[PDB]
Each structure stands twice: as C-alpha cells, then as structure tokens.
Amino acid sequence: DKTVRWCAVSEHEATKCQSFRDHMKSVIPSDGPSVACVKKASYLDCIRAIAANEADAVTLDAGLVYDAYLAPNNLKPVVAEFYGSKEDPQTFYYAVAVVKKDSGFQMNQLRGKKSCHTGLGRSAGWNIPIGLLYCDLPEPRKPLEKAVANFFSGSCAPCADGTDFPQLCQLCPGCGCSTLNQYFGYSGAFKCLKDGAGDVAFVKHSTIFENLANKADRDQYELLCLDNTRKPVDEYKDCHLAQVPSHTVVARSMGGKEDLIWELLNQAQEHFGKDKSKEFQLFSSPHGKDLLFKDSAHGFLKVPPRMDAKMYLGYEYVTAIRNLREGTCPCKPVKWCALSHHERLKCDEWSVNSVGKIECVSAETTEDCIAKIMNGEADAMSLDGGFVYIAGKCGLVPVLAENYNAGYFAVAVVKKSASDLTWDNLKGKKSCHTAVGRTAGWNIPMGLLYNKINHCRFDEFFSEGCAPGSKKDSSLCKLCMGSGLNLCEPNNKEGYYGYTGAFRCLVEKGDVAFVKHQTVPQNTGGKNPDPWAKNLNEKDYELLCLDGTRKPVEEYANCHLARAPNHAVVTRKDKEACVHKILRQQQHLFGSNSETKDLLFRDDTVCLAKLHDRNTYEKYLGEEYVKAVGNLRKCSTSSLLEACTFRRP
C-alpha cells in the first residue's frame, strides 16, 4: 500500500490535500509513499478516525495533542513543524509569567495581585497559568472565570465576561476582545505589565524581546519560576510555566505509519517546502489560511521515536491541561521506580514496612523509569552518575546522594603479570567496561582518553572488548559473554555487566578493566565464591596510574583515574522537598543500624547524604564531568537522551 491517509478538517483543507496528493505523485517513485485524503468535521473526528485506522495523520495544536493521547485514541507525536530558520529551528514556545524586578512575590503568592492576560481561552495567556493555578483558586471553581475573579484582585482578561465578573476587566474595562483594546494579545498583556496596570503578564518567552529592544529596559523585568524563585527574562528555558509544541503531526502509537509519514513529509518539504517556488507550495494555499500546516512553517523535523505525548508536551503543560480537563484537587507517598523482579520485590517489602509512605512502580529499563519520574508515574530512583546526567538533561534533579564512607574512585585494573601495560598507551588492547554511559567504566576513563586522541570511536582504539550497551556488531561487544539476545546487554543477563562483571571480564578475557576501588578487593581472596573469582588473589592485579606507572590494588588513593560522583537519588523539582524528607525518615528507621546484590541502592552505601548547594546535575556531577560527557555523546546512543535533547539542546 504505502499510503498515508491525511485527515482534513475542512473543505479547503481537503482541496489542498488533494493538490498535495497529486503533486507528490510526480516527485515520488512507484515504490514510495502516496497520499490519500480523508475529510472529517473537526480535529477530534480526525483523532478518532486515525485511532479507528480510517486515517493516519493530522497536524494539531498542543491541546489536541493531549486529547489525541488519551485513551481510547492513543496517538503519538511523530513529526514536528519548525519555524524561523533551518540552522536554528524553532519547534516550541515557552509560556512565561513576566513580572517587574523587585516587585517582591513568587508564583505561590499570586493571590490578590493584578494580572494581565493575552485573552481568555488562549494557551500562554490563560489556559496554562490558570491550569497551573487551578487548585489555588477558591471554591467553587465553577465557573472558572468567577474563581479567577476571586483569585486576582483585578485583571485585564480580554474576552472575559466582565458583566458578571467585573474584577476580570478592572485593568481594561469591557474586556475588549479585539486589538481595539490596548491590553489585548501578546504585546497588549505585556503592555498591561509595562504600563504598571498589572503585576504579572502571562505571555510567551519572546514577547518581552519583541516589545523592548534595549537590554537595559529588559533588565527591569523578571520571570516567575515554578519553584518559587525568579530568573532574568533571557533564561526562560529554566524558568517557564510550560513548554509548548507549536504544531505536531500525530499518528497511532502502534500501527503507525510513522516511517511512511516522515518519508512522505520529508520528501514534500524538499520539493514543495519553503523557498522551493513550485506552483504547489506545502506551506501556503491560495484559498484559506494554515491549511493542513501552518503557513509560517519552514519545514518538518522528525520527532525522536522514544517520545510519547506526555514527554513531548512536558510535565508542566500536562499538569495544567489535566487540571482544566478534570478539575480534581486533593507530601503523599514517594513512588519508587524498580527495574527488575528482584528490585520490585525489595521495595514491595519496603512499602509495607513503610506503612504506605513508600509505593512502588516498575519499569523494564533505567531509561523507562526515568521517563516515569519525568511524567509523574514515578517519583524517585537511585542512579549512577551517568544516569544522573541523563536524568538532569531530562529535567530531573538530584535529591539525595548515596554515601559509602566526596565520591568513589575510578580505577583501571590490569593483570600484574602483564607488566607492559601503562595508561600512557593502551591502544590495541582488550578493554572491559561496566557499561557505556556509566561513571566508573565509561565517562571517567573514556572522557580522559577522549582528550588524548580527540575522538570517541573507542572500538577503533581498543582491539576489542566488552562494553555493555554498545552496538551488537561493535568490537566492544566481542568479549562479552551473554548468550542470544543477552550478549552485550547493559543488565544482569550479561555476565560482564557492572562493576563486578567488568572485573570478571578482565580476569577471563580482557587486558584492562575500568571499575571502582572496591571491585578487586571485594571479588578476591575468596570473598566472592563463584568459580571465576574464588581463587583469585588481589596482589596479582595492579592499577594504572595517570602518570604512566602502576601500583597495587589497595593503593587506589594515589593511583586512580578520577574521583567519581556518588550515585544519587533523582526526582522532579516539585517533589524534591518531599523526597528529601521522607527518605531520611526511612533511613533513620531502616538504615545501616538486598536479597541478591545492589537492589535499588548500592549495598556499599551507609546513608543518603544531603546535597545543599549541588542540587542540579551540573553542580552535582561537576564541571569537568559534564564536559567529558558532552564530548562522549557525539558517539553515544540513548534514545531517551535524544528525546530530551530534542526539547532542550
């Protein structure tokens, strides 16, 4: 078939679709995607048609992306319209709350202030802020305008019912729903703030830049952050009410046909997109505005495949829209994310011994669990520093640090009889890594090595190795020992995965093992009874030091590659306080005074430590760690990181 059935919501849109269908047939070969045109009465009918497999694709505003995600529709974002420019594609805008500098209040102190809105029923100006504030509104919250009129002391809410709720028009009497009103729209709401009518303007990240050319003027303004702090107006990416995708093509989550849709649209923009100047133009139409796509669009970007609608819309936006749609209002239990049947059994027991203060969700991989913390299905997990990096890039923050005694030591272990090996040159040698992306076995050693050879294709530096998480055909999977689909997997059914697995990898096959300072002592001298380790002696192994010589294993203090940031618990900023407080209550009750090895927490850890200043991944991991990880991800995978980076480069 190879047919993409596009859904139109108007007769004009169907006519353009039909033109679209006919022109693509001149540019796409026989074996290529074709266009079919389905005509429905509304966006929701298109959503339902696609879910019913009567059509396949439609482009929607953010609100309808949410509707399309809810059961029984279950559509997913697949292609994004971008704007502005090809070198700097603009896919999202940011809803922000702008205030005057030194006005002395935060997001959680908006009650009784004067508010400026773009217009009632608009996203940045109304639905997003009121959605976020919904449970702060006084009861009864229906009708919504009466509740807002009793929340702010006075407002300019263009198009509000000022006859029944005059407070909403105090700053623009009559609540004029047109440009005839000086405070209507994006520039109008900001002017409401600039002129001193209101205390806060609910606008987009760009509004202040388009109305105030001089930076000195903009320096008299600030942004309200959802964490109840303020930031300058050029830091909206760390200080907004919501991140909003402008226009998104959706498709069924299963059954697609996403690859066809992208193939179709990518070819359409190459032949009929911006500045192509054919008789057919994808981003205009002689009759009507914004048919099928926005006329201001400059092209399409493929949405990363790990992305679902909740992750695409973002936590803040989904919170606001859900409050509007559902209208439900209440620390509460901390929902821990477990990774295996063995990890879930542990926290299940933790939950019942915590008497409800702990609850348990399970996902099949670390990244899935991270996605659940981002969208609110989960709340906290403990992660290696490399995953704290991914969690941080995805908007999460470190809340507590696992303390085992300043971090643990990353060391390079070699067999003592191999006296030739030095850190100075290990090219062509066989390497053993915890897994790609982890602190001790990858980010620290391969970050340092990156500085020496100025590239990160390490399978061409080492002859072969085991680095679980590498591509199955890579030479860094050749030494691994998992069988079938398990070979080179970053989990337990790969016997060379982890701190201990990488040491075993060295004992049996490798030349160098990148692990931590306790690994060799803990799996030598009979402490590990498994046949591969049982008769090993730790004086038969040395550590490579940075200067180029070697020392014994217990001399790691003066022969390590770098100090490693300890594993940390991560959560969202809105649960940071509660997770901080509930876990210290839990370790006071069940602390150091797992059934297998290292479930939920490292068994080395004695306590969960306070972070104080270092409550962001950049400040927790440190400057050089982040730089090295930034260097290594040019060669790295991680579909989650790709999805998070798509929303924040």
Q: Which residues pair with 34 in a beta bridge?
A: 3
Smallest distance from Fe ion to CB 517, Å: 12
Which of 60-68, 242-250, 317-325, 439-447 is the region at the interface with Fe ion (rule: CB under 5 A)? 439-447
Smallest distance from Fe ion to CB 449, Å: 18
Smallest distance from Fe ion to CB 499, Å: 7
Of 440 and 559, CB closest to Fe ion: 440
Asked whether the beta carbons of 79 and 249 are under 8 A apart, the reply is yes
Smallest distance from Fe ion to CB 434, Å: 7
Of 158 and 407, CB closest to Fe ion: 407
Residues annotated in a binding site = 61, 93, 118, 122, 124-125, 186, 247, 384, 408, 434, 438, 440-441, 499, 567
Q: Distance (Å, rounded) from C-alpha 109 to C-alpha 491? A: 47
* Helix count and strand count (H, E) for the chain: 22, 26
Burial tier of 616 (Cβ tally within 10 Å: 0-12, 13-18, 19+): middle
Q: Distance (Å, rounded) from C-alpha 33 to C-alpha 4? A: 7
Which of 19-27, 268-276, 377-385, 574-582 is the region at the interface with Fe ion (rule: CB under 5 A)? 377-385
Of 245 and 441, CB closest to Fe ion: 441
Please give the single-letter amino acid code of residue 411: V
Interface with Fe ion (CB under 5 A), residue from 67, 222, 367, 384: 384
Dihedral (C-alpha) 90, 92, 98, 104: value to the nearest 10 degrees? -120
Of 362 and 382, CB closest to Fe ion: 382
- Window 617-636: contact mask with Fe ion (x via CB under 5 A): --------------------
Of 115 and 439, CB closest to Fe ion: 439
Smallest distance from Fe ion to CB 395, Å: 22
Q: Distance (Å, rounded) from C-alpha 147 to C-alpha 123? A: 18
Place of tokens 């040019």: 634
Burial tier of 178 (Cβ tally within 10 Å: 0-12, 13-18, 19+): exposed
Question: CB nearest Fe ion: which residue?
Answer: 384
Q: Report cis status (omega within 30 of 0) of the bond before 72.
A: yes
Using alpha carbons only, give the angle 64, 69, 74 rounded to the nearest 5 degrees.
135
Of 13 and 384, CB closest to Fe ion: 384
Interface with Fe ion: number of residues (CB under 5 A): 3
Smallest distance from Fe ion to CB 410, Å: 9
Residues annotated in a binding site for hydrogencarbonate = 118, 122, 124-125, 434, 438, 440-441
Of 384 and 511, CB closest to Fe ion: 384
Which residues within the stretch 440-459 sit at the binding site for Fe ion (CB under 5 A)?
440
Please give the single-letter amino acid code of residue 83: Y
Q: Distance (Å, rounded) from C-alpha 394 to C-alpha 368? A: 12
| Longest pairwise C-alpha distance within the chain | 90
> Angle, to 10 degrees, between the axis of helix 341-353 and the axis of helix 576-590?
80
Under DSSP, is residue 576 helix (H, G, I), strand (E, B) or coil? Answer: helix
Which of 18-26, 41-49, 435-443, 482-490 is the region at the interface with Fe ion (rule: CB under 5 A)? 435-443
Smallest distance from Fe ion to CB 516, Å: 7
Of 242 and 440, CB closest to Fe ion: 440
243: Cβ contacts below 8 Å, ≥ 6 apart: 92, 93, 94, 95, 313, 314, 316, 317, 647
Of 131 and 441, CB closest to Fe ion: 441
Backbone φ/ψ region at 211: left (φ over 0), alpha (ψ -120 to 50), beta = alpha
Which residues within the stretch 183-242 sit at the binding site for Fe ion (CB under 5 A)?
none
Q: What single DSSP character describes residue 288? A: S
Of 185 and 385, CB closest to Fe ion: 385
Q: What single DSSP character describes residue 634? A: T
Which of 90-98, 182-190, 206-214, 376-384 is the region at the interface with Fe ion (rule: CB under 5 A)? 376-384
Smallest distance from Fe ion to CB 598, Å: 10
Interface with Fe ion (CB under 5 A), residue from 170, 403, 439, 474: 439
Which of 184-192, 237-245, 392-400, 433-441 is the region at the interface with Fe ion (rule: CB under 5 A)? 433-441
Which residues within the stretch 128-167 sit at the binding site for Fe ion (CB under 5 A)?
none
**3-state per-residue secondary structure call for 492-526:** CCCCCCHHHHHHHHHHHCCCEEEEECCHHHHCCCC
Residues annotated in a binding site for Fe(3+) = 61, 93, 186, 247, 384, 408, 499, 567
Smallest distance from Fe ion to CB 443, Å: 9
Smallest distance from Fe ion to CB 384, Å: 4
Residues that bind Fe ion (CB under 5 A): 384, 439-440
